[PDB]
Amino acid sequence: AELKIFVSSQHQPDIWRKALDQYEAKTPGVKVVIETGGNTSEMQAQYLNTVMSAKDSSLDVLMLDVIRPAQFATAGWTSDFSGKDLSAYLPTYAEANTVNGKIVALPAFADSMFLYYRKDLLDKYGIKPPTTWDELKEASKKVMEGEKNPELQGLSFQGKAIEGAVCTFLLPYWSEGKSLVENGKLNFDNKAAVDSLKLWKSFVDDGISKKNISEVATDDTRKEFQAGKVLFAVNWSYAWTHFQGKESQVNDKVGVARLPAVKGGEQTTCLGGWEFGVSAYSKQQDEAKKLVEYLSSQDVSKFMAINAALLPTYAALYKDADVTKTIPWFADALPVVETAKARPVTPRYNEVSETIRTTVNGVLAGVMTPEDGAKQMESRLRRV
Ligand SMILES: O=S(=O)(O)C[C@H]1O[C@H](O)[C@H](O)[C@@H](O)[C@@H]1O
């Protein structure tokens, strides 16, 4: 059989390729081909909606974001792993991949947002990693003043109208102790929503973040930090491999911290991560399941942690000696993953994402005020 697997371009398809070569080498008569979609999750989702809506049978295995199971379950777009127990996997992912009793997908890898920081620069100015956005502003000012570097950004975060801007919006909202869904219903704290949009705007206005932060996607943050142009970056675990790689200016100059809190708030972060679904329209159900069981296996989890800084779905791999030798900070990441806040679980998540990310982007592009943004977001969300 020739299986086709849709892989996020953001999640190291060349490294997944090394795992698939080990699979082929030990599975005579099976070949795997990677189709590589957009960097961002909302573009991958728009593409999969069209091929899955059209019942297209070319894809066998789908790498899907943690926010996807509700949609994919309700639409019947994946083959359930009937009577599968997800107890080997972090409960947050066991839970994300179960919808009305159905195991929609096997966890592929974990993720959460961290604060990447230039540990060389904080050391140089004697600064402690910031625990509040206010400490991060103060640290940014001190470093940018001393560095006399017209290309050094204080903070890079995602302001482009992408899935990651949803995460941007919720970080200060969650930090204030608010939720967007309470007892299944939309629970919109106006004041917390406005304060989140003004916080992100304040980084641009205060000269800590670049004027065109509204054009910055997740991987732009990764590229600019890697290039030595960013003191503080909001990003995901995959960025670490690029930072420590052959094409980086910041080898051994990167610290990892929990995201700062809003003043008086909690250091909350966004749950990310991905899972492997078998397409309901695969003509190779059995062979695809065998591939997903290998790709969701502890040995592959471990390989992808070491080679791609993708956080394990297996709790035991966080303290594995080879994992922690390659990426020391993984030894302390699991509590961040297991307490990370989840975006709303809903089959209509795409419409939820569209509303929040366009509002964030509009405010950061100076199209609307934070105040109007919050009002627009609430109105649009109310009817979705
Ligand atoms: O970069 S983005 O696609 O806009 C946002 C995504 O980032 C990371 O890949 C996470 O693992 C995903 O959960 C998240 O949705």
Q: Residue 200 is encoded by which pair of tokens?
A: 């992100």
Q: What is the CA radius of gyration of the chain?
A: 21
- Residue 318: both structure tokens together: 């966080």
Cα 41 from Cα 244, distance rounded (Å): 24
Query: DSSP class of residue 153?
Result: E
Q: Which residues pair with 112 in a beta bridge?
A: 271
Burial status of residue 186 (CB atoms within 10 A of its CB: 0-12, 13-18, 19 or more): middle
Residue 158 near residue 216, CB atoms below 8 Å: yes
Handedness of CA 106, 311, 300, 40 (dihedral sign): positive
Which protein residues touch ligand 1 with a CB less than 6 Å away? 10, 40-41, 65-66, 111, 162-164, 218, 236, 272-273
Pocket test for ligand 1, best of 218, 222, 353, 356 (most atoms within 8 A of CB): 218
In what helix (H) or strand (E) does residue 369 lie, and over which residues does it extend?
none
Please state how this structure was obtained: X-ray
Contact 231, 116 (CB under 8 A): no
Structure tokens at 332: 């302390």
Q: 92 and 312 in contact (C-beta within 8 Å)?
A: no
Nearest atom of ligand 1 to the alpha carbon of 270: 13
The encoded tokens of residue 234 equal 């909001």
**CA 148–ligand 1 middle distance (angstroms):** 33
**Count of CA atoms in the C-beta half-sphere (13 A) of 157:** 31
Q: Are 365 and 83 in contact (CB under 8 A)?
A: no
The reported resolution of this PDB entry, expressed in Å, is: 1.8
C-alpha span between 28 and 281 (Å, rounded): 24
Distance between CA 174 and CA 186 in Å, rounded? 14
Atom of ligand 1 nearest to the CA of 8: 9
C-alpha 239: how far from chain center: 10
Q: Which residue has the tokens 């939720």?
A: 179
Atom 14 (ligand 1): residue with closest C-alpha? 272
Residue 234: enclosing H or E segment and its boundaries? strand 230-235
Helix (H, G, I), strand (E, B) or coil at 232: strand
